[PDB]
Design goal:
homodimer, 145 residues, alpha+beta, seven-stranded mixed beta barrel, 2 helices, structural protein, mutation
């Protein structure tokens, strides 16, 4: 539903992700994240944020998230987000940066987690401090483009 | 149950708390927090953690939280706690210290949040950054 033609790519580079699957060991792999901002192909007046997860090893490992300004309102409440739709894609990049610059000796420590299931995957960026683990943001991705 | 005689207080001082009860203004008031450690009178091997929140008046009414090592197992799972029961009170104190030394111009900023909903009060310590608000720990308290 997203218009890839009239779209602006703010982010497109590999990001260290702990890919978790049920009844399987955790696989740490460099996954490619592409963050796009623009309007829908169905509506050129509705601003939609798009995040695409891909892989260099698996060509058809595709997970996609599309969030409009309307759905962000419910997401802002559940995630207790303190910014509006404008600077929201930027805050994702800031969190994604911490995962990239993450070091085993860092405290607190950030890492990207992607839990794959049947027909839905759950992506999140968590914090590992000296006490507990905190999910900074939780997003739901769908298979395909 | 809890042996008040053989109990050690590790923390007892007022803490700035943002009362987020109902849906009104973020009422700020310093509440007195007390963290005790001890064992059960029936089972000396069972270590017990006691947390007391107060408003400090002549009523001496206290909302208390009691977490034994058995209750800690269930608490460790939900809150994703990565430390043992021994270092657990010490980490709570550290978060309480951050709330006290917190300033409006800090980023990120720690603060204590209180919410009272029908008898049960929900206390949690959250982090205020440039993006969102994240609870580091969420504890339920009971009257008396």
């Amino acid at each position: 539903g997203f218009d890839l033609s009239t779209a602006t790519t703010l982010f497109w580079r590999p990001v260290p992700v702990h890919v978790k699957q049920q009844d399987r060991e955790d696989v740490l792999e460099e996954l490619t994240f592409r963050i796009l901002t623009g309007v829908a192909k169905q509506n050129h007046n509705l601003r939609i944020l798009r995040i695409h997860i891909s892989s260099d090893s698996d060509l058809f490992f595709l997970h996609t998230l599309e969030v409009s300004e309307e759905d962000f309102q419910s997401l802002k409440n559940d995630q207790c987000i303190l910014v509006d739709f404008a600077s929201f894609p930027g805050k994702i990049i800031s969190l994604l940066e911490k995962c990239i610059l993450a070091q085993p000796g860092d405290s607190p420590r950030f890492q990207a987690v992607l839990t794959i299931r049947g027909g839905e995957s759950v992506f999140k960026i968590v914090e590992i401090n000296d006490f507990c683990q905190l999910p900074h943001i939780t997003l739901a991705f769908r298979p395909g483009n």
